[PDB]
């Protein structure tokens, strides 16, 4: 009822030029969240056991 | 009481679930130790090998013994009945009571 649906149309945008800046931090911080997940994994398993 | 064979069968089964409980407990300690191993202290590193080896050897032989029990089930096949004599034994005891009634020197 809001609108006749033709809303989403294909479009093109270029990929941002890569560098050392963001991937290394992205992956080390992913390491951080997965070390977190390991910690809560161990804690939950200990509580369950 | 039950014949002995059933007695050692139930003892072996009880040993089986106690071994399973020990396996679960050792899983708990190995999960515990891996956390600090990931933390970064290498002192408890030697204990890790021992814990893993004991965990695996506890997991294996328990299942092996249970397999032996299930195998025993295979050859144990072929290897109110009491009522057939029940009245008789009742009969016996009743007459015994009469004897106690019949002799006044034993009613003390």
From Swiss-Prot, chain A:
Subcellular location: Nucleus
Subunit-structure text: Component of the Mediator complex, which is composed of at least 21 subunits that form three structurally distinct submodules. The Mediator head module contains MED6, MED8, MED11, SRB4/MED17, SRB5/MED18, ROX3/MED19, SRB2/MED20 and SRB6/MED22, the middle module contains MED1, MED4, NUT1/MED5, MED7, CSE2/MED9, NUT2/MED10, SRB7/MED21 and SOH1/MED31, and the tail module contains MED2, PGD1/MED3, RGR1/MED14, GAL11/MED15 and SIN4/MED16. The head and the middle modules interact directly with RNA polymerase II, whereas the elongated tail module interacts with gene-specific regulatory proteins.
Additional remarks: Present with 1720 molecules/cell in log phase SD medium.
Similarity annotation: Belongs to the Mediator complex subunit 17 family.
Functional description taken from the UniProt entry: Component of the Mediator complex, a coactivator involved in the regulated transcription of nearly all RNA polymerase II-dependent genes. Mediator functions as a bridge to convey information from gene-specific regulatory proteins to the basal RNA polymerase II transcription machinery. The Mediator complex, having a compact conformation in its free form, is recruited to promoters by direct interactions with regulatory proteins and serves for the assembly of a functional preinitiation complex with RNA polymerase II and the general transcription factors.
UniProt protein name: Mediator of RNA polymerase II transcription subunit 17
From Swiss-Prot, chain B:
Signal peptide bounds: none
Gene Ontology, cellular component aspect: core mediator complex; mediator complex; nucleus
Function in brief: Component of the Mediator complex, a coactivator involved in the regulated transcription of nearly all RNA polymerase II-dependent genes. Mediator functions as a bridge to convey information from gene-specific regulatory proteins to the basal RNA polymerase II transcription machinery. The Mediator complex, having a compact conformation in its free form, is recruited to promoters by direct interactions with regulatory proteins and serves for the assembly of a functional pre-initiation complex (PIC) with RNA polymerase II and the general transcription factors.
Protein name (record): Mediator of RNA polymerase II transcription subunit 11
Organism: Saccharomyces cerevisiae (strain ATCC 204508 / S288c) (Baker's yeast)
Coiled-coil annotated residue ranges, if any: 56-100
Family: Belongs to the mediator complex subunit 11 family.
Alphabetical keyword list: Activator, Coiled coil, Nucleus, Transcription, Transcription regulation
UniProt xrefs under InterPro entries: Mediator_Med11
Localization per Swiss-Prot or TrEMBL: Nucleus
Biological processes, Gene Ontology terms: negative regulation of transcription by RNA polymerase II; positive regulation of transcription by RNA polymerase II; positive regulation of transcription elongation by RNA polymerase II; positive regulation of transcription initiation by RNA polymerase II; RNA polymerase II preinitiation complex assembly
Main location: nucleus
Record's keyword annotation contains NAD: no
UniProt cross-references to Pfam families, sorted A to Z: Med11
GO function term, MF aspect, one: TFIIH-class transcription factor complex binding
Subunit structure: Component of the Mediator complex, which is composed of at least 21 subunits that form three structurally distinct submodules. The Mediator head module contains MED6, MED8, MED11, SRB4/MED17, SRB5/MED18, ROX3/MED19, SRB2/MED20 and SRB6/MED22, the middle module contains MED1, MED4, NUT1/MED5, MED7, CSE2/MED9, NUT2/MED10, SRB7/MED21 and SOH1/MED31, and the tail module contains MED2, PGD1/MED3, RGR1/MED14, GAL11/MED15 and SIN4/MED16. The head and the middle modules interact directly with RNA polymerase II, whereas the elongated tail module interacts with gene-specific regulatory proteins.
Other comments on record: Present with 396 molecules/cell in log phase SD medium.
